[PDB]
Design a protein around this motif. Structure first.
Motif, PDB file in Angstrom:
ATOM      1  N   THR A  55      32.543  88.349  -6.435  1.00  0.00           N
ATOM      2  CA  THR A  55      32.024  87.548  -5.616  1.00  0.00           C
ATOM      3  C   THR A  55      30.437  87.846  -5.611  1.00  0.00           C
ATOM      4  O   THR A  55      30.043  89.038  -5.689  1.00  0.00           O
ATOM      5  CB  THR A  55      32.392  87.600  -4.066  1.00  0.00           C
ATOM      6  N   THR A  56      29.663  86.818  -5.089  1.00  0.00           N
ATOM      7  CA  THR A  56      28.179  87.013  -4.969  1.00  0.00           C
ATOM      8  C   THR A  56      27.916  86.004  -3.871  1.00  0.00           C
ATOM      9  O   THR A  56      28.591  85.115  -3.583  1.00  0.00           O
ATOM     10  CB  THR A  56      27.279  86.745  -6.152  1.00  0.00           C
ATOM     11  N   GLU A  57      26.712  86.738  -3.112  1.00  0.00           N
ATOM     12  CA  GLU A  57      26.271  85.707  -2.049  1.00  0.00           C
ATOM     13  C   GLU A  57      24.828  85.145  -2.511  1.00  0.00           C
ATOM     14  O   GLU A  57      24.177  85.679  -3.136  1.00  0.00           O
ATOM     15  CB  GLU A  57      26.007  86.590  -0.908  1.00  0.00           C
ATOM     16  N   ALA A  58      24.908  83.477  -2.552  1.00  0.00           N
ATOM     17  CA  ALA A  58      24.059  83.150  -3.085  1.00  0.00           C
ATOM     18  C   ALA A  58      23.436  81.624  -2.126  1.00  0.00           C
ATOM     19  O   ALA A  58      24.351  81.084  -1.482  1.00  0.00           O
ATOM     20  CB  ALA A  58      24.122  82.420  -4.380  1.00  0.00           C
ATOM     21  N   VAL A  59      22.392  81.113  -2.465  1.00  0.00           N
ATOM     22  CA  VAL A  59      21.764  80.014  -1.593  1.00  0.00           C
ATOM     23  C   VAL A  59      22.526  78.803  -2.036  1.00  0.00           C
ATOM     24  O   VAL A  59      22.922  77.869  -1.112  1.00  0.00           O
ATOM     25  CB  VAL A  59      20.254  79.840  -1.764  1.00  0.00           C
ATOM     26  N   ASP A  60      22.952  78.757  -3.432  1.00  0.00           N
ATOM     27  CA  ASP A  60      23.436  77.444  -3.858  1.00  0.00           C
ATOM     28  C   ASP A  60      24.315  77.730  -5.118  1.00  0.00           C
ATOM     29  O   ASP A  60      24.246  78.899  -5.706  1.00  0.00           O
ATOM     30  CB  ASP A  60      22.364  76.376  -4.186  1.00  0.00           C
TER      31      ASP A  60
END
Length: 54
Positions: A17-22
């Motif tokens: 997983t990665t956390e991203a704005v979009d």
């Protein structure tokens, strides 16, 4: 937002997983990741989940 990559190539299978704005931002992250790992495959995207499956 949390984005998921289900990977299947180059001797590896993974779910990360990665956390991203979009989604476009997550996609760059995951495509670079796949490239770093020698995976060259076909991609899907649905509801936050990417797959790359060579």
């Amino acid at each position: 937002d949390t984005y998921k990559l289900i990977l299947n190539g180059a001797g590896l299978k993974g779910e990360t997983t990665t956390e991203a704005v979009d989604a476009a931002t997550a996609e760059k992250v995951f495509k670079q990741y796949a490239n770093d790992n020698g995976v060259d495959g076909e991609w899907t995207y649905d509801x936050g989940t990417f797959t790359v499956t060579e």
